[PDB]
Scaffold this active site. Structure first.
Site, mmCIF file in Angstrom:
data_model
loop_
_atom_site.group_PDB
_atom_site.id
_atom_site.type_symbol
_atom_site.label_atom_id
_atom_site.label_comp_id
_atom_site.label_asym_id
_atom_site.label_seq_id
_atom_site.Cartn_x
_atom_site.Cartn_y
_atom_site.Cartn_z
ATOM 1 C CB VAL A 1 23.576 4.036 44.762
ATOM 2 C CG1 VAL A 1 22.537 4.900 45.187
ATOM 3 C CG2 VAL A 1 23.703 3.570 43.509
ATOM 4 C CB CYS A 2 25.025 2.693 49.638
ATOM 5 S SG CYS A 2 24.197 1.416 49.437
#
Length: 165
Positions: A58-59
């Site tokens: 996600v990062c």
């Protein structure tokens, strides 16, 4: 506000920063191990985004979104902050083709987490930065703030782009 990661709920630590507040300048460290000031002058909007680690899926999408936006709007400053050492920030960005993004580390002073109120409290992610986006106007005042409720969700990019027009 309390952020969730699976079964964990997090208190946010540091000083609360709200829309209308003057965003504090903080010391961060870049890939050259140079101390830099977060705030930039001579720019219409400053976008400052934090994430728990560039090693996350996600990062990486978040970093890749702001890397692409860096080239798309030169009149806007984009900064991404994590507790990752600048060494691993450089290596991840190098491996994943993120070469435009102003990627900075909060490891030395935790000044970003402390002064923007996105330090994660007790839990597995304690001491990492909450997934978050701040937009500052030309005077360094906060005009937009998102601290993502579920840390496994991406920021609201549609909300963000509306602020930058």
């Amino acid at each position: 506000q309390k952020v969730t990661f699976k079964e964990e709920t997090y208190q946010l630590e540091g000083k609360a920063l709200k829309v209308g507040d003057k965003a504090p300048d903080v010391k961060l460290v870049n890939g050259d191990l140079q101390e830099v000031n977060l705030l930039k002058q001579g720019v219409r909007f400053q976008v400052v985004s934090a994430l728990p680690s560039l090693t996350g899926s996600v990062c990486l999408l978040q970093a890749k979104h702001f890397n692409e936006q860096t080239g798309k709007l030169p009149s806007v400053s984009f900064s991404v902050i994590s507790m990752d050492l600048p060494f691993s920030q450089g290596q991840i960005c190098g491996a994943e083709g993120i070469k435009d993004l102003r990627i900075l580390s909060d490891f030395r002073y935790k000044a970003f987490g402390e002064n923007y109120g996105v330090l994660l409290g007790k839990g597995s992610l304690q001491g990492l930065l909450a997934r978050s986006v701040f937009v500052l106007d030309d005077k360094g005042v906060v005009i937009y703030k998102e601290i993502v409720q579920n840390i496994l969700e991406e920021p609201n990019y549609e909300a963000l782009l509306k602020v930058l027009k």
